Amino acid sequence: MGKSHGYRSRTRYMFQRDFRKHGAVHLSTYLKVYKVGDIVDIKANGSIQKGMPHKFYQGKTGVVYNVTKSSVGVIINKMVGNRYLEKRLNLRVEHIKHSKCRQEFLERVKANAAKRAEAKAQGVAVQLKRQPAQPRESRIVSTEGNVPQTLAPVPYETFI
Amino acid sequence: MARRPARCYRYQKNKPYPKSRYNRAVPDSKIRIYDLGKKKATVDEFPLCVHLVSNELEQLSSEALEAARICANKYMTTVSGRDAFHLRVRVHPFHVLRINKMLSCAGADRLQQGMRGAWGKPHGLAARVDIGQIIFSVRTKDSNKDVVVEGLRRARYKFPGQQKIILSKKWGFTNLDRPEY
Amino acid sequence: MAFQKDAKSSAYSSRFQTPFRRRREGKTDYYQRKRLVTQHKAKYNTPKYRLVVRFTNKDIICQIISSTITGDVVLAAAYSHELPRYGITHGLTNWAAAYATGLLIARRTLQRLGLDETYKGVEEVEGEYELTEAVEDGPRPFKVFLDIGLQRTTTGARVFGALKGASDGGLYVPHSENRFPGWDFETEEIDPELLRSYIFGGHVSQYMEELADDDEERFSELFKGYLADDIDADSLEDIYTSAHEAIRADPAFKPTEKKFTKEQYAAESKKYRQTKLSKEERAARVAAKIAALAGQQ
Amino acid sequence: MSAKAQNPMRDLKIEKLVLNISVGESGDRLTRASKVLEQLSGQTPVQSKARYTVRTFGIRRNEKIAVHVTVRGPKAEEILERGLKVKEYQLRDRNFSATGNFGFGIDEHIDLGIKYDPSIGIFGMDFYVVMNRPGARVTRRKRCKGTVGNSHKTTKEDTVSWFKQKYD
RNA sequence: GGUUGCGGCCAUAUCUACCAGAAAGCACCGUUUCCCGUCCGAUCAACUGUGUUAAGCUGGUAGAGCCUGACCGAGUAGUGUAUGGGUGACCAUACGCGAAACUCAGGUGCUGCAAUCU
RNA sequence: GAGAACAGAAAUCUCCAGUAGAACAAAAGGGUAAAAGCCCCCUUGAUUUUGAUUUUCAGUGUGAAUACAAACCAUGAAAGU
RNA sequence: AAGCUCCAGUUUUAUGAGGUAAAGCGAAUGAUUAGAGGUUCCGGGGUUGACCUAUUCUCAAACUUUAAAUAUGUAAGAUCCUUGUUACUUAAUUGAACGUGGACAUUGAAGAGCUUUUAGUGGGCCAUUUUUGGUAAGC
RNA sequence: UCCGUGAUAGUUUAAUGGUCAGAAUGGGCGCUUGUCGCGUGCCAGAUCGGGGUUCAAUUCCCCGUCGCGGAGCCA
């Protein structure tokens, strides 16, 4: 047929930054290193030239699975088809930004978690939630078997 | 000109199109001038301002725009003479019209191939005139109110979108507009 | 006159946005900065010239700076002003002053500090002389990386002499021997490589040897006496002080601060100015302040 | 009071004299009018390169179209002394710029100089005199560029006053 | 009252009148013989101080630029959702949402570490 | 814009004002100011080997690209690149 | 189908993004235009002052970027500690983060995981909404 | 009407590598020659209109205007 398919096409709104974001990015962002299990958005800065993902991946959130030299390895899930696999993306730190939402989420659950401990000692807020969590569980916890369980619905039978 | 009523043009066709790269050699704007009468005059002498406003959402032809506006102008300039009051056209004509231009008989149909096929060869200009939009904004003196109204009547039978004559308010009226000096 | 900028503006307004205070101020290049930091070794800033311009021709400074989330944190600093506390009366601007300040910052970085130490392997590397850079380390150098700032790579430029002072200081720093303001250029003794020379310490000696009226306190031998003092282990600085007095203090600074405009609003001076402008308009009428003010009547 | 008094800083200096000859090789010679500049200034000139599109002959932009000398300091003053002396005076204010700058044109042959030793010459070559205040380095020096204000800028009145004071 | 190192938020800090870090917490000027820049010490690369607050950094003070809000414009333009009316095109209706100017306001920066002061 | 005899195409050089409108071989659009642009030097890493992975294509090759580690050097102050 | 084995969703939070209306940049038909500095020519008169171009503050709507988009569908995203022992990249130098070994303490509901083999395509249609071409069309 | 193909001084037509444009004739200029003419010395272009790219466009794109060739099916 006709025309291309193509990485660069349809980027004009996404690639481009605001009047305020315009100008060289700040090397602090370039410098930043992250740990595994951190939650990071991927959306490329227009003002960096290289390290850029496929354009089609921007606005997705992933977890830093591992790092191998300057660029980092991100797990994200795409969509549509049969037995879709989760993807690894090599995407630079300039393009990767923290996510506040889990950080404040983590503080709140943990801040809460202290309030409870005192209640577990001397206090009864609950009671029903208390019953599963002592009987429940190891995993250790923290494992790669839970990932295929999540992986399996992402290829959705109905949508198809 | 060449017939097609305005059955072809009036309903709101097309992701615009009139973009400057994408159309060398459009046929002209035929509108003779947009402001008329006393061009060398501010708005503020005139105590009366009359408007003509749409009921429908349309594309008006360039020829209809000039024909309606000249018909109004002959009524104004005959009754109020040459150095009359002052008129402004609200809507200039810049939406570009494609139509495919008269085949052949060669058994050569479209000779193209079979076809048609974008890149249609331009037929001229139209103006978007959407619901409640104002085609003419005319500034006058109350002892010639009648004259502008018949000029606006003689304008209506020269575009197809149904429109209404109206007396304006904007900011102010014309005298809450004036007290600061 | 020109603004010119005001009519064109938005784009013109863009011009700051790209830098911060540091480029407007004019010290720092963000690409030059970039190259050091990504790597997690500290920036060893030795501005010699052009700070804002916070030295030169009277003084020099060295700070070893690292990054953190809050912004950049200075682990240690040394000033050439503090260097005469150890003893050295002569000019703060020269090579010997730069080398000895370079030792001082490195001595302050180690400090054997943090509980944490670093006495071994070999501190002190003496004030020396030093033919070529000896470390037990050998090829490894880290936890300090040279940040010149604007200042140039000219072989024989101070900025570098501080780094060499650091190397002999106990910080061990990446270097190339052809680039130094070399050992005799501090003085000390010299040289290998394609490049040559063989005095610049010690150029002041030669400058003085040529007759002319300059500063007092003699000749060549005095670099050695105080450089010798500089060799010494004697660390741990300082001062302390008078402290402040009250309150928020200075004679200039008060008409030079105040009430309108505050961090908050200069309600009183803007309102005094509006009302004054308004009376002045009432009497004359024509131009506002800024040149337009009229309308068709 | 806002502050009236007498200070040298708030004075003028000779920023530079650029003597620049715009010839155009093959008419007169390669760069050999450089020999004329060389005597006149006392120092070596450097070649002037075109970038430019013109238009006429000169379509190469890499070549030496012209030659120029930058003199500063005492070097500048010695040329100004002879240079001012040819051209009579009280020369006109129109020659002066808005900037506090002036330039005049004349042969190299004018000046105390051997005519014999220069192999070729030429009118010519603008004598351009840059005058500015000491503060000027804030725009000129790299790092901490700051524009010069209108105050700090020299005026046509100041330049004429200063230059007219000596050797005129 | 905080000048300044190193930064971060990076249009609340773009631009144009004029007051201030300063008798031993600056910039300048002067050695520009020289390592050093050359095409000139200008650039720069170096060694230093008659002293000067004029610019410089930055602090003191005023407008166009701009973010942020209040005020109408007042839920207006537009909009997924379910549907009535119109000759057509087109419109409305309930269900959830909601931009443009206007005028007024705040701010001609913020924040953190240290060289830490008369 | 001003300034310089002659010069118009007039480079040229000079001064001021100048934030992405310039430059960046080549579409488009995007993007950047001690820059990835412009200049000066020095140089060959346009090296060999392997390539996690994406795009190809959601699993399908060539090709492409983004990252390495081994091997080897450069420049560079060096980090690094 | 035949078996194997015993988790799915959603408001709410946070992200960035369609869009299209009035500003900004770039383009700009394209008027009307007062005020007002300056082009460049000649041409007449008593420096002034008729004559054409044209900055500059300044005014009617269109169109492709961008703010803020407003929207709306989206549209991915929802364990901790201590103890010892090991590693690690990076000055005989500073640190984390790895891995282990051991102990401690925590509105929904079968919509559902995996495998072998199998078949009919690999020519569609209409409507609704949002369109794109086409005068239009049971295109 | 589609797709092909062009255009340069009064006129017909050569030509390029992006920096440089010709010939021939026709004419205007003398001398020949009784006098004209043939001959013989001398002379002189907005490269169709158009916008764009570039350093620099006659030369490289894009369009029209005109003059050409080549198609043209089963009714």
Residue of C21, C24, C30 for testing the chain A interface, max A β-carbons within 10 Å:
C30
The helix or strand, by DSSP H or E, that contains position C204, with its residue range, turns out to be helix C203-209
Pull the structure tokens for residue B103: 């085949």
* Shortest CA distance from C71: residue in chain A: A28
Question: Nearest CA to the C1' of E29 belongs to which residue?
Answer: D134
What is the rounded CA–CA span in Å between residue C155 and residue C172? 19
Find out whether D49 and D65 touch, Cβ atoms under 8 Å: yes
Strands (E), chain D: 13-21, 46-49, 64-71, 102-104, 125-132
Contacts of C165 (CB under 8 A, 6+ apart): C98, C99, C100, C101, C102, C103, C104, C105, C106, C186
* Strand-strand pairing, C72-79 and C61-67: antiparallel
Give the residues after which the backbone of chain B is interrupted, taking a C-to-next-N distance over 2.5 angstroms as a break.
none
Contacts of B28 (CB under 8 A, 6+ apart): B62, B124, B125
Query: Among C194, C150, C151, which residue's Cα sits nearest to residue C176?
Result: C194
What is the rounded CA–CA span in Å between residue B145 and residue A142? 85
What is the nearest nucleotide to C40, using C1' and CA?
G90
Does D have 3 or more CB contacts under 8 Å with B?
A: no
Find out whether C110 and C88 touch, Cβ atoms under 8 Å: no
Find out whether A72 and A92 touch, Cβ atoms under 8 Å: yes
- Tally the C-alpha atoms within 13 A of residue C210's C-alpha that lie toward its C-beta: 5
What is the rounded CA–CA span in Å between residue C53 and residue C265? 33
Query: Among C147, C156, C107, which residue's Cα sits nearest to residue C127?
Result: C107
Edge-to-edge strand list for the sheet holding B48-54: B35-37, B86-89, B134-140, B48-54, B163-167
Find out whether B95 and B18 touch, Cβ atoms under 8 Å: yes
Find out whether B134 and B60 touch, Cβ atoms under 8 Å: no
What is the rounded CA–CA span in Å between residue A42 and residue B5? 55
Query: Among D102, D111, D125, D94, which residue's Cα sits nearest to residue D28?
Result: D125
Query: Among B171, B16, B148, B164, which residue's Cα sits nearest to residue B75?
Result: B148
Place of tokens 């916070």: C54
DSSP state of C37: H
- D70 CA to F12 C1' in angstroms comes to 13
Query: Among C263, C283, C195, C184, which residue's Cα sits nearest to residue C227?
Result: C184
Neighbours of C264 (CB within 10 A): 8
What is the nearest nucleotide to B112, using C1' and CA?
H2
> What residues of chain C lie within 8 A of the CB of A26, using their CB?
30
DSSP string, chain B: ----TTTTTSS---S----GGG-SS--------SEEE-SSS-GGG-SEEEEEEESS-EEEEHHHHHHHHHHHHHHHHHHS-SS--EEEES----EEEE-------SS-TTTTSS---S-PPEEEEEEEE-TT-EEEEEEE-GGGHHHHHHHHHHHHTTSSS-EEEEE--SSSSSSSSS---
The structure was resolved experimentally with cryo-EM
What is the rounded CA–CA span in Å between residue B181 and residue C293? 11
Pull the structure tokens for residue C47: 């501005």
* Shortest CA distance from C23: residue in chain D: D144
Find out whether B36 and B90 touch, Cβ atoms under 8 Å: no
| CA end-to-end span of chain A | 26
What is the rounded CA–CA span in Å between residue B45 and residue B76? 18
What is the rounded CA–CA span in Å between residue C51 and residue C26? 8
Instruction: Report the alpha-carbon angle D152-D154-D155, nearest 5.
Output: 130
- Report the SS3 class of residue A30: helix
Q: Which amino acid is at A55?
A: K
